[PDB]
Design a protein around this ligand. Structure first.
Ligand SMILES: [Au+]
Ligand SMILES: [Au+]
Ligand SMILES: [Au+]
Ligand SMILES: [Au+]
Lengths: 421, 421
């Protein structure tokens, strides 16, 4: 069929009339191959004759041809011969530097790569050369709504909020302590203002401890901006969450999210609970009703610690008619022993709330019924939207022994893990 | 001591008179650090005030700052947002391509490298960018005396050599068969011309088998160019070796080489013996006296097979007074059984010759004495210039059992191995 092509490695002047002249670099076609050291070839012009089979290589870009390459010339010999002057040998690329020689083994690639000290250096490189990537880095992707974080206070050193700077724009809700209205502070920044009905809380004890809660800053943690004592009944001012509480969101705003966003809702809360855990600050009543959702769908936890200052015994007492029994572990129901682990238990139930899109935990049971059955070993079943792995996480929160339950550090790790899928 | 420097990740307008204005990208100096969410900072202008500690990063080029970076935005979310448009996330570089997204894990380096299909591609790349190498490839190293290989014949299809084309330039030596003169063929190419005294060889048998030896081409193999029958006594024409035989070179040309070049002398011969082995062609009398050295110090083997056609019984007979007893294994001395293994044995002795700079093997002993002692188990001691590893190689050639001796393939491998050091 087709003729085998070769390249002349060396010049060859014909020694007689049988010979064909070879010119280095030029290409020739074999008419007759053989174990013999002479082959019958054809010039690129059509001229024919015999050429030394050792003076030629095979068809595509072989190696003996180019400048550098030096077969089996030892490392020592290559060093004697050898800024940036190089050669390749049996592979290995040897280079002269300042005087010294650097050797790089070729396995086609060296072995190592560009060793950048920082990510920005890496990015700067591939913005100039694709060097192995699918395309040169050309355009960094945007974030239409960047949004700055929350400041621990509305300016430095201001717990007191002057209601002259508060414009009551819209009523939004009606929390357990009073009417939650929405407004701008100094007619610029959005702020949620929560009325506290008199008698609801022991103001003196609460407000003094709000000073601490002020200095609790975290991106997934509904920022407490301040309070006002002059205007009574009082008013705690907090970060504005445009989509209201998570429970109502899970139930009445289902068109606003996909089931693949649920795990992220858990992650958001978990990041927040890790923070409160690190500050050894117990939330005391973690539940979907106490998480809020902002304009961008981010879930943040609110009303953390707030139950310590509720005067209504029916909320505080573990035997009370409105106590969060359905979110409470056995140790809280039996001996009112709150701890990080009680928050973790609550989180498990909160995870369940999220994945059942806001269904009431143990909805068939009474609070005392739930208490008894939990204590026996009744655990919330897997919601349909929760995968085996996700359920394993929320279930771990419900271990009857407190110290055997994960930490929010651990849970956060586990959640980011399945998010990968 | 020195003030801690930071960069503003976001703008911050002062909300009151305690606050210091932050401008994204600009740098600020901390006067007071703290677990509190507000830090006391200093403008690059000297202005002071409090800034949100969450609005700033630490001193050197952190990460949240640049365009791309997106913290913990899952692979799926990054895909929805995302030719060559990119972002970096927790690391991983995600890139848009044509539409599809390619993900590269950053461990700072990706994981892989430029994957070239050929060495010439590799070299072409680093000639433009040093990309991790000590310097960009700039200048390929030279080879002053390149020199073309040997052609199996002086032109295609010419065993017969017309002595009218031969210019007898200089006498050189005086081989066992006759005077070796040096000359140019057609007053151009250098050629060695070896006179064959009449009666020395059985010409008819030899010359006919020289036709085969003609088509034995190898770079470390003294090329047999041709013969002439018309002029008698005859004349075999061969490749010209300017430095004569290796034995005399090892003894009288010691100023011309270093001991580090010895292993290369062995390698050269071994490459040649591998070739003759592959062509199942026995050398029959391998020894330093039968190797030649060219102008560039390269050692090549000559007179291969030639002993089959020597008429003098005292050379051929294993009991003869001039038989190569000192280079012969037991099986050759006892039963005249030549094979590849007999050549390997000879090579071992040749290695010894080289590393004792041409000393006579068993010089104290007579040929019959050597024969007896070899047969008992006397082996040549390690010469001082031979390392333990080199000696191990030449020693392997001397195993009393033939089939237990290495092949020239194996030996070649072993020699290139210690050459590395
Ligand atoms: Au107020
Ligand atoms: Au149930
Ligand atoms: Au002649
Ligand atoms: Au000895």
């Amino acid at each position: 069929t087709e003729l085998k092509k070769v390249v002349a490695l060396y010049d060859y002047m014909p020694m007689n009339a049988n010979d064909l002249q070879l010119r280095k670099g030029e290409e020739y076609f074999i008419l007759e191959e053989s174990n013999l050291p002479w082959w019958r070839a054809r010039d690129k012009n059509g001229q024919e004759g015999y050429i030394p089979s050792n003076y030629i290589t095979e068809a595509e870009d072989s190696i003996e041809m180019y400048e550098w390459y030096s077969k089996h010339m030892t490392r020592s010999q290559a060093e004697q011969l050898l800024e940036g002057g190089f050669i390749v040998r049996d592979y290995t690329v040897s280079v002269f530097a300042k005087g010294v020689i650097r050797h790089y083994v070729v396995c086609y690639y060296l072995a190592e790569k560009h060793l950048f000290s920082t990510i920005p250096e890496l990015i700067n490189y591939h913005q100039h050369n694709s060097a192995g990537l699918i395309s040169r880095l050309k355009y960094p992707v945007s974030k239409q709504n960047k949004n700055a974080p929350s400041t621990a206070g509305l300016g430095y050193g201001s717990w007191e909020i002057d209601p002259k700077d508060l414009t009551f724009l819209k009523e939004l809700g009606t929390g357990q302590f009073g009417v939650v209205k929405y407004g701008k502070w100094r007619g610029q920044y959005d702020v949620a203002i929560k009325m506290i009905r008199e008698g609801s809380m022991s103001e003196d004890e609460f407000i003094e401890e709000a000073k601490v809660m002020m200095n609790l800053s975290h991106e997934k943690l509904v920022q407490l901006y301040g309070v006002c004592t002059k205007q009574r009944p009082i008013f705690i001012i907090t970060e504005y969450m445009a989509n209201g509480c998570l429970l109502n969101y899970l139930r009445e705003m289902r068109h606003r999210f996909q089931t693949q966003q649920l795990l992220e809702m858990c992650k958001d809360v978990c990041e927040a609970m890790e923070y409160l855990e690190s500050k050894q600050f117990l939330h005391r009543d973690l539940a979907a009703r106490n998480c809020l959702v902002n304009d961008q769908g981010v879930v943040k936890v609110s009303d953390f610690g707030l139950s310590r200052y509720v005067l209504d015994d029916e909320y505080t007492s573990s035997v009370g008619s409105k106590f969060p029994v359905r979110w409470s572990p056995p140790e809280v129901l039996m001996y009112s022993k709150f701890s990080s682990k009680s928050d973790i238990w609550a989180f498990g139930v909160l995870m369940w709330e999220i994945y059942s899109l806001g269904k009431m935990p143990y909805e068939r049971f009474t609070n005392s019924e739930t208490a008894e059955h939990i204590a026996q070993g009744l655990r919330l079943y897997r919601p349909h939207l929760a995968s085996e792995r996700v359920y394993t996480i929320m279930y771990s929160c419900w271990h009857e022994k407190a110290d055997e339950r994960p930490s929010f550090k651990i849970l956060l790790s586990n959640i980011l893990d399945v998010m990968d899928e």
